[PDB]
Amino acid sequence: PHRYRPGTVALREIRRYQKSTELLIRKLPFQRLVREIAQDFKTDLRFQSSAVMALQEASEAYLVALFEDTNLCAIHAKRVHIMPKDIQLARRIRGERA
Amino acid sequence: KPHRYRPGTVALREIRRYQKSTELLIRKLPFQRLVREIAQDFKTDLRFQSSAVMALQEASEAYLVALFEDTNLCAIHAKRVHIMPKDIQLARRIRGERA
Amino acid sequence: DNIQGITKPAIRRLARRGGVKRISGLIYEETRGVLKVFLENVIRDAVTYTEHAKRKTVTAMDVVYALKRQGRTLYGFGG
Amino acid sequence: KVLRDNIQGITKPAIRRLARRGGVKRISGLIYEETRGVLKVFLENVIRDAVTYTEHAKRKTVTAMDVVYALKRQGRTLYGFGG
Amino acid sequence: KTRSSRAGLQFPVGRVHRLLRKGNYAERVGAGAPVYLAAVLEYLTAEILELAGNAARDNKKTRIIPRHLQLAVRNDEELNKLLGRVTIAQGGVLPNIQSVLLPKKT
Amino acid sequence: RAKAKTRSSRAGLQFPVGRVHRLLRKGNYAERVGAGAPVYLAAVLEYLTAEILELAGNAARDNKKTRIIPRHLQLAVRNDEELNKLLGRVTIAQGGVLPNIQSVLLPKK
Amino acid sequence: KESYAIYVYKVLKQVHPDTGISSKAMSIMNSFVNDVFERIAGEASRLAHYNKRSTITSREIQTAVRLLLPGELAKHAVSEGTKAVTKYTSAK
Amino acid sequence: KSRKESYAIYVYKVLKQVHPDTGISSKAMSIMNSFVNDVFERIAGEASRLAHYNKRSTITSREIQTAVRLLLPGELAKHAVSEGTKAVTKYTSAK
DNA sequence: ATCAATATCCACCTGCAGATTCTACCAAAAGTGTATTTGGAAACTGCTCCATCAAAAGGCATGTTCAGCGGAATTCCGCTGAACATGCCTTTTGATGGAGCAGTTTCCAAATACACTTTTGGTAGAATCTGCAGGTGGATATTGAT
DNA sequence: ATCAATATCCACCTGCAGATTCTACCAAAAGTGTATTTGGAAACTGCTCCATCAAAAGGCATGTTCAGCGGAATTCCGCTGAACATGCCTTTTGATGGAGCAGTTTCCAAATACACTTTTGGTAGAATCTGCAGGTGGATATTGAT
């Protein structure tokens, strides 16, 4: 009849993922996405596996850092839950928007 | 019987007014002494072309105006209308001027 | 669709490395959209270096050069 | 003549005007000192590079071009004016 | 005949070819390179001048000033993007007040 | 000896001066490249390389490892104010991030 | 000192025959052309080196233009470039 | 198969002076290689601009020095400058 | 404070994917020496434009009073995220033809390098021309008090 | 909702600073025409390493239950800013000494340009070695229920 409170698990997850460096999105799904998007720019393309990897590393590192800024925006609004408007603010201030 | 504009009516009047014009908003000589002071602390005996000073002023004012827009967006995010130092700080942290 | 291949648990894992403690339900589709815009900008440029070199295979270097002009320099595949 | 405290030459009314151009409606009293601090850092980095270009060319005069190159270095390109 | 007329251009192909050489961009510069580049430059200045001239017109003016150039650039998605890190001296900004800051309700 | 002392040995460097010169030339950076330039440049590159490895090596020792991996390059760079600034817009593959949780997010206690 | 002024002025007359331009605006237009030239040339320069090419041709310039300009401007810039080279090429 | 030049052996040399008993993984060497190339291009680019700004055809050690002061953060620039001055001095003062 | 269920640590163990070691071949470098060339420092100096003092005046900063009202503090509670254990559908891992990425050879369209001829963009300074800043006044909102 | 107080919009008017119009010189371009050199498209080809497939592996989808977040409503304190009086100090029109930027000619330290020789960093195939990633056990801290 034991249960961990919300937040205790989250916190241990943060500890865990800030300790490791492995990729966090699965490879095949990511690969399919990369190929689908590229097909819109030019058909019948091949990818060096190192190219998909470079893409996954840059994408994850890009998203992790965006989540850091998103968190600072949620916190600025006195919240602990990040929301879409937090991401939007961060992007807008970043110039990816204005 | 008296008369008084409400807090906010004047602000909006001013925003419209300044977003409409393009002249520099900081007094000229004060800004020039400021540039001369900071420069001097880096290297003594420097002269400045008057247009180098005007160039720094156009760039500084553009930087500050754009920074306040972002600051404004951070205050609004926190459901406020008053910008505070922490809005300016959040904006600069996100911009990477110290993130 | 495929973008749904990027799952809630993986998006959640990214958020955790970012120090995020609590997550709203609408974050997942928001993330996917941002990820897609990111890949589109970068892949577009990578594919443009590929075509320029007259290849049919996108190389690590094409990606690296693309990340660099997007101001997102990446070390480790050359750069 | 010694130059001191010129950062106070950036008055409260001038800072308010800049915030109006930036669309700001209400301003906390602490904004003025925070902004002066921000301007100072900004001017320090640009003048630092502008003066480095001046010295490299062996000049005693900072030119509009020196400032324009310093702004471009920092990703704040400026048009017209030297700049 | 000038290379600019041969190409049907207003911008100076000769000058651009020379600027290409003195800028040390490569050991060699093909003959088409400067023609193409001059065409592209002429095209972008036509685009911005079309838009700035229109802004001058909306403000009842015959002479384009920095502010008309800024209005034309910030009001155009793509030009705004190409010049996203550029500051036009004496251009000011685009009139724009956040919704939440306007008075009353409804 | 074997009369032919490489430029690097003359300058007292581990980095390749001949290579750096060659690279400055074939890079279209200028019409000419003075003799001192590649020397100065090689020394700067070697210095910065020593600087990061020194710190990355310590980062490895602290984890009881003898082999520097990407993770150790990332910890060394992001924990040094200056290297972090110089590499502020760089992503080191497989480097991860610095352990850091927002104060306001820790347990109520 | 050379400038693109007389050329900017010719294009202005083609798009707005009765509009003039202040010297400051002209100076901004001159910074713009120089800026675009350098950016396009830089991209072309790197493009050549990445491909071990010692020559910059209309082909690198075109790729540089596609990498540098936003969608609709790229399309029209490319058409104008292509057209000027095709015409120039049939003239002699 | 064509040659692929890299700074890896000189990076390894430097590693041994600094930490004789420490090794480096392949992926880490690749990161250091990218690092050297990135710094090289950034410094060369700024020196290039510097010579062009001053209408000079030559990139000398003087341009490398100013490029360095413009690019590196305070203290790093301080040491990097002395390291470079030292090697040029050592180079000149010799046969 | 007292267990009870877990999560976290640490010391030890060892199989192997990845790193270190020795040999051998060689095009590509890098060092060296001679001959020719030149970029740019030095010395002289024309002339722009930067620093500076002068003086007059009103635009605009400063300092005070006083009231409007935003925003933090506090209580309340709807309902959304998060924990958790159930069941398998997708991703991961390793074996395999073949598409191209590259290495190599050929040779011509196209790019230097060189000697003249000719056209033009700059600019020096004259002048003349003209859009609009800026002061003025009055029709038209937009607000604030009631 | 009618009023009064004010700010804003706006077309008309004119002195004038900034602008487009030149006459005339021209150093520097830019163009014309061989002569010489060569970068890189094109065709052919060997070895990678990429796309595809099947079997083994393990992370994700799903629904119930409920802690607890954070927006809604309420309150009131104290800061912000409108209004206003006062007077400084910026702005502006001027003029002047001379620092120091920049044009010009002189000339050698240093860079380019082959040509010949030595060394070296990179690649390939084989053999041997090892740091540490996962795995186990057992201790003990941490968290949640009472």
Short mmCIF file of N, CA, C and O in Angstrom, two decimals, chain D residues 5-63:
data_model
loop_
_atom_site.label_atom_id
_atom_site.label_comp_id
_atom_site.label_asym_id
_atom_site.label_seq_id
_atom_site.Cartn_x
_atom_site.Cartn_y
_atom_site.Cartn_z
N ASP D 5 30.72 59.52 -12.79
CA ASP D 5 29.28 59.40 -12.64
C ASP D 5 28.41 59.79 -13.83
O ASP D 5 27.24 60.11 -13.66
N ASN D 6 28.97 59.76 -15.03
CA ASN D 6 28.19 60.12 -16.18
C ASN D 6 27.01 59.18 -16.45
O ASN D 6 26.09 59.56 -17.15
N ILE D 7 27.00 57.98 -15.86
CA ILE D 7 25.90 57.05 -16.08
C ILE D 7 24.58 57.65 -15.56
O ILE D 7 23.50 57.24 -15.98
N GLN D 8 24.66 58.60 -14.64
CA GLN D 8 23.46 59.23 -14.09
C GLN D 8 22.94 60.25 -15.09
O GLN D 8 21.86 60.79 -14.93
N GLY D 9 23.71 60.51 -16.13
CA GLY D 9 23.23 61.42 -17.17
C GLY D 9 22.10 60.74 -17.94
O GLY D 9 21.34 61.38 -18.68
N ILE D 10 21.98 59.43 -17.80
CA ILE D 10 20.88 58.74 -18.47
C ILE D 10 19.76 58.87 -17.43
O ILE D 10 19.64 58.07 -16.52
N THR D 11 18.97 59.91 -17.58
CA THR D 11 17.91 60.20 -16.64
C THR D 11 16.73 59.28 -16.61
O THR D 11 16.51 58.50 -17.53
N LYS D 12 15.98 59.38 -15.53
CA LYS D 12 14.79 58.60 -15.35
C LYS D 12 13.82 58.88 -16.51
O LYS D 12 13.28 57.96 -17.10
N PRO D 13 13.59 60.16 -16.85
CA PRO D 13 12.67 60.49 -17.95
C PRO D 13 13.16 59.93 -19.30
O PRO D 13 12.36 59.54 -20.16
N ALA D 14 14.48 59.90 -19.50
CA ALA D 14 14.96 59.34 -20.76
C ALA D 14 14.69 57.83 -20.78
O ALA D 14 14.27 57.29 -21.79
N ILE D 15 14.92 57.14 -19.66
CA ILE D 15 14.68 55.71 -19.60
C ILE D 15 13.18 55.43 -19.79
O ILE D 15 12.82 54.45 -20.44
N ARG D 16 12.32 56.29 -19.23
CA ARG D 16 10.89 56.10 -19.41
C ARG D 16 10.53 56.22 -20.89
O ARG D 16 9.76 55.44 -21.38
N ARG D 17 11.10 57.18 -21.59
CA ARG D 17 10.83 57.37 -23.00
C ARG D 17 11.22 56.13 -23.82
O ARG D 17 10.47 55.70 -24.71
N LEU D 18 12.40 55.57 -23.53
CA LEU D 18 12.83 54.39 -24.24
C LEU D 18 11.85 53.22 -23.99
O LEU D 18 11.59 52.40 -24.89
N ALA D 19 11.34 53.12 -22.77
CA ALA D 19 10.42 52.04 -22.44
C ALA D 19 9.06 52.27 -23.17
O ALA D 19 8.39 51.32 -23.54
N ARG D 20 8.68 53.53 -23.37
CA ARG D 20 7.47 53.81 -24.11
C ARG D 20 7.64 53.34 -25.56
O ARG D 20 6.72 52.73 -26.11
N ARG D 21 8.81 53.59 -26.16
CA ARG D 21 9.02 53.20 -27.53
C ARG D 21 8.94 51.71 -27.59
O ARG D 21 8.50 51.17 -28.58
N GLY D 22 9.32 51.07 -26.49
CA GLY D 22 9.30 49.63 -26.40
C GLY D 22 7.96 49.08 -26.00
O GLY D 22 7.83 47.88 -25.73
N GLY D 23 6.95 49.95 -25.96
CA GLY D 23 5.62 49.50 -25.63
C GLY D 23 5.31 49.30 -24.17
O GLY D 23 4.28 48.69 -23.87
N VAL D 24 6.15 49.79 -23.25
CA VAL D 24 5.90 49.58 -21.82
C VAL D 24 4.91 50.57 -21.22
O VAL D 24 5.02 51.78 -21.44
N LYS D 25 3.96 50.05 -20.46
CA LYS D 25 2.91 50.86 -19.82
C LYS D 25 3.20 51.30 -18.39
O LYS D 25 3.02 52.47 -18.07
N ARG D 26 3.65 50.39 -17.54
CA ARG D 26 3.96 50.72 -16.16
C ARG D 26 5.39 50.35 -15.78
O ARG D 26 5.86 49.25 -16.08
N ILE D 27 6.06 51.24 -15.07
CA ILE D 27 7.45 51.00 -14.71
C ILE D 27 7.75 50.98 -13.21
O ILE D 27 7.46 51.95 -12.51
N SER D 28 8.33 49.89 -12.70
CA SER D 28 8.69 49.86 -11.27
C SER D 28 9.82 50.83 -10.99
O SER D 28 10.67 51.08 -11.85
N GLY D 29 9.86 51.38 -9.78
CA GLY D 29 10.92 52.31 -9.44
C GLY D 29 12.36 51.77 -9.53
O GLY D 29 13.30 52.53 -9.73
N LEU D 30 12.54 50.47 -9.38
CA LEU D 30 13.88 49.94 -9.46
C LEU D 30 14.42 49.80 -10.89
O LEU D 30 15.62 49.56 -11.08
N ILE D 31 13.56 49.97 -11.90
CA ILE D 31 14.00 49.80 -13.30
C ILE D 31 15.12 50.73 -13.72
O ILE D 31 15.98 50.36 -14.52
N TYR D 32 15.11 51.95 -13.19
CA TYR D 32 16.10 52.92 -13.64
C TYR D 32 17.53 52.49 -13.39
O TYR D 32 18.35 52.56 -14.32
N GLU D 33 17.84 52.05 -12.18
CA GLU D 33 19.21 51.58 -11.88
C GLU D 33 19.54 50.28 -12.63
O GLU D 33 20.67 50.09 -13.12
N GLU D 34 18.57 49.37 -12.73
CA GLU D 34 18.84 48.16 -13.50
C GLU D 34 19.21 48.51 -14.95
O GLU D 34 20.19 47.98 -15.48
N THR D 35 18.49 49.44 -15.56
CA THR D 35 18.75 49.82 -16.95
C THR D 35 20.07 50.51 -17.10
O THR D 35 20.79 50.32 -18.09
N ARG D 36 20.43 51.35 -16.14
CA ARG D 36 21.72 52.00 -16.31
C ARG D 36 22.80 50.93 -16.32
O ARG D 36 23.73 50.99 -17.11
N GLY D 37 22.66 49.94 -15.44
CA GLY D 37 23.65 48.88 -15.36
C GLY D 37 23.75 48.11 -16.67
O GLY D 37 24.86 47.77 -17.12
N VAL D 38 22.60 47.85 -17.29
CA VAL D 38 22.55 47.12 -18.56
C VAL D 38 23.17 47.94 -19.68
O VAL D 38 23.87 47.40 -20.54
N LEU D 39 22.92 49.24 -19.69
CA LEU D 39 23.49 50.05 -20.75
C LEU D 39 25.00 50.08 -20.62
O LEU D 39 25.74 49.93 -21.61
N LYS D 40 25.46 50.20 -19.37
CA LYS D 40 26.89 50.27 -19.14
C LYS D 40 27.63 49.04 -19.65
O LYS D 40 28.70 49.16 -20.27
N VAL D 41 27.07 47.86 -19.39
CA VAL D 41 27.71 46.63 -19.87
C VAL D 41 27.68 46.64 -21.39
O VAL D 41 28.65 46.32 -22.06
N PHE D 42 26.56 47.04 -21.95
CA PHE D 42 26.45 47.05 -23.39
C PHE D 42 27.48 48.02 -23.97
O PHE D 42 28.19 47.67 -24.92
N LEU D 43 27.59 49.22 -23.43
CA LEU D 43 28.56 50.16 -23.97
C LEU D 43 29.99 49.65 -23.74
O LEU D 43 30.86 49.83 -24.57
N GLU D 44 30.23 49.00 -22.61
CA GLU D 44 31.57 48.49 -22.36
C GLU D 44 32.03 47.50 -23.44
O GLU D 44 33.13 47.64 -23.95
N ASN D 45 31.19 46.52 -23.77
CA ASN D 45 31.59 45.55 -24.77
C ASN D 45 31.79 46.15 -26.14
O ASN D 45 32.72 45.75 -26.81
N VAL D 46 30.96 47.10 -26.56
CA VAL D 46 31.11 47.66 -27.91
C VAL D 46 32.34 48.57 -28.00
O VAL D 46 33.12 48.47 -28.93
N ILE D 47 32.50 49.47 -27.02
CA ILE D 47 33.63 50.40 -27.01
C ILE D 47 34.92 49.62 -26.92
O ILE D 47 35.88 49.93 -27.62
N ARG D 48 34.92 48.57 -26.08
CA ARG D 48 36.09 47.71 -25.95
C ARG D 48 36.53 47.23 -27.35
O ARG D 48 37.69 47.36 -27.70
N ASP D 49 35.61 46.68 -28.14
CA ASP D 49 36.00 46.23 -29.47
C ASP D 49 36.26 47.40 -30.38
O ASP D 49 37.24 47.39 -31.13
N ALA D 50 35.44 48.44 -30.33
CA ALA D 50 35.72 49.58 -31.19
C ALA D 50 37.14 50.10 -30.93
O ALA D 50 37.88 50.34 -31.88
N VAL D 51 37.52 50.24 -29.65
CA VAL D 51 38.88 50.73 -29.33
C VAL D 51 39.94 49.73 -29.71
O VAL D 51 41.03 50.11 -30.09
N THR D 52 39.64 48.45 -29.67
CA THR D 52 40.64 47.49 -30.12
C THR D 52 40.94 47.70 -31.64
O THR D 52 42.12 47.61 -32.04
N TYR D 53 39.91 47.97 -32.46
CA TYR D 53 40.12 48.21 -33.91
C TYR D 53 40.90 49.52 -34.12
O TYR D 53 41.71 49.65 -35.03
N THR D 54 40.61 50.52 -33.28
CA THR D 54 41.30 51.79 -33.40
C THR D 54 42.79 51.59 -33.18
O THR D 54 43.58 52.04 -33.97
N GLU D 55 43.16 50.92 -32.09
CA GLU D 55 44.55 50.68 -31.78
C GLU D 55 45.21 49.81 -32.82
O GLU D 55 46.37 50.04 -33.17
N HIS D 56 44.49 48.80 -33.31
CA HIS D 56 45.12 47.94 -34.29
C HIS D 56 45.53 48.75 -35.51
O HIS D 56 46.54 48.45 -36.13
N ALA D 57 44.76 49.77 -35.83
CA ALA D 57 45.10 50.57 -36.99
C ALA D 57 46.07 51.68 -36.63
O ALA D 57 46.41 52.48 -37.49
N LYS D 58 46.47 51.72 -35.36
CA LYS D 58 47.41 52.72 -34.86
C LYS D 58 46.90 54.14 -34.90
O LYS D 58 47.66 55.06 -35.20
N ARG D 59 45.62 54.33 -34.58
CA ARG D 59 44.98 55.64 -34.59
C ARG D 59 44.70 56.13 -33.19
O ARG D 59 44.64 55.34 -32.25
N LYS D 60 44.50 57.43 -33.04
CA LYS D 60 44.17 57.95 -31.72
C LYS D 60 42.68 58.28 -31.69
O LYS D 60 42.10 58.48 -30.64
N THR D 61 42.08 58.30 -32.87
CA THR D 61 40.67 58.64 -33.06
C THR D 61 39.74 57.43 -33.33
O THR D 61 39.97 56.66 -34.27
N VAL D 62 38.72 57.25 -32.52
CA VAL D 62 37.78 56.17 -32.75
C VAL D 62 36.85 56.63 -33.90
O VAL D 62 36.20 57.67 -33.80
N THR D 63 36.82 55.87 -34.99
CA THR D 63 36.00 56.23 -36.15
C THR D 63 34.62 55.55 -36.09
O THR D 63 34.43 54.57 -35.36
#
